[PDB]
């Protein structure tokens, strides 16, 4: 159980540094809170929404021009 979750990790620092190295090599083969994820995703949806809403409004004004 190499990369487990130990009870206290500040008091196991030399250990976790060594494990970081082990992982680096063995998977350099491939390298070569989810509420923070939910919050980031919702924020980015919101920003996209507001930019699209802005674009929509400017074009509807320009369509008022050519009625």
């Amino acid at each position: 159980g190499t990369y487990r979750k130990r009870f206290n990790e500040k008091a196991r620092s030399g250990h976790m540094a060594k494990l970081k190295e082990l992982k680096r090599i063995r998977n350099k083969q491939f390298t070569r809170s989810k509420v923070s994820r939910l919050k980031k995703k919702r924020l980015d949806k919101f920003i996209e929404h507001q930019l699209k809403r802005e674009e929509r409004k400017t074009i509807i004004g320009k369509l008022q021009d050519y009625k």
């Binding site: 190499t2 082990l22 090599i25 063995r26």
Partner: protein, 188 residues
């Protein structure tokens, strides 16, 4: 420090091993001597069991042995002139085994002219008796003759001087001499 464990090495499939124990004493390795030339000193390590080893550093004479004639003389090593493993140890004059050195010629010439009376180069009636009793064997070689005319002979080291403190050796003769002359001078 410097260990001789093989369990830090990739396994023969190319795998990568997690270590299961700390370094052990019985796997150690100390520092190379890098034993230069000049003004003897020797430091004695205590190895396993008790068991001295005499790590030599800066040694300058050796018991070089003339194999064909069957003798040996303590002469003075004068400089590494070729080394098979590593061309750096030439540049920095480091005595390891199989280093090709130049020694002294003078004890050997003195001995030879004592043993046969032949004066390498170009009365006490017992002495005439012996020298004439062995004059068929008064024939060395063409090449070693020329080295004796120069003043210093090529010689190989055959004692590990970081392990026993003594840089003995032997004098090149025969085909080994032709090989090393060719190598040494086809570098130059």
């Amino acid at each position: 420090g410097i260990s001789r464990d093989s369990r830090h090495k990739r396994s023969a499939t190319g795998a990568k091993r997690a270590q299961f124990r700390k370094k052990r004493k019985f796997e150690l390795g100390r520092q190379p001597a890098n034993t230069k030339i000049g003004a003897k000193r020797i430091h004695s390590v205590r190895t396993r069991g008790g068991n001295k080893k005499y790590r030599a550093l800066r040694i300058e004479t050796g018991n070089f042995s003339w194999a064909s004639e069957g003798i040996s003389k303590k002469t003075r090593i004068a400089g590494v002139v070729y080394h098979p493993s590593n061309n750096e140890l030439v540049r920095t004059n480091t005595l390891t085994k199989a280093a090709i050195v130049q020694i002294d010629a003078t004890p050997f010439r003195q001995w030879f002219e004592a043993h046969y009376g032949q004066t390498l180069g170009k009365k006490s009636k017992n002495a005439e008796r012996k020298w004439a009793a062995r004059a068929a064997s008064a024939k060395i070689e063409s090449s070693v003759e020329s080295q004796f005319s120069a003043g210093r002979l090529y010689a190989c080291i055959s004692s590990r001087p970081g392990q026993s403190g003594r840089c003995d050796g032997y004098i090149l003769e025969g085909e080994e001499l032709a090989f090393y002359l060719r190598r040494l001078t086809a570098k130059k």
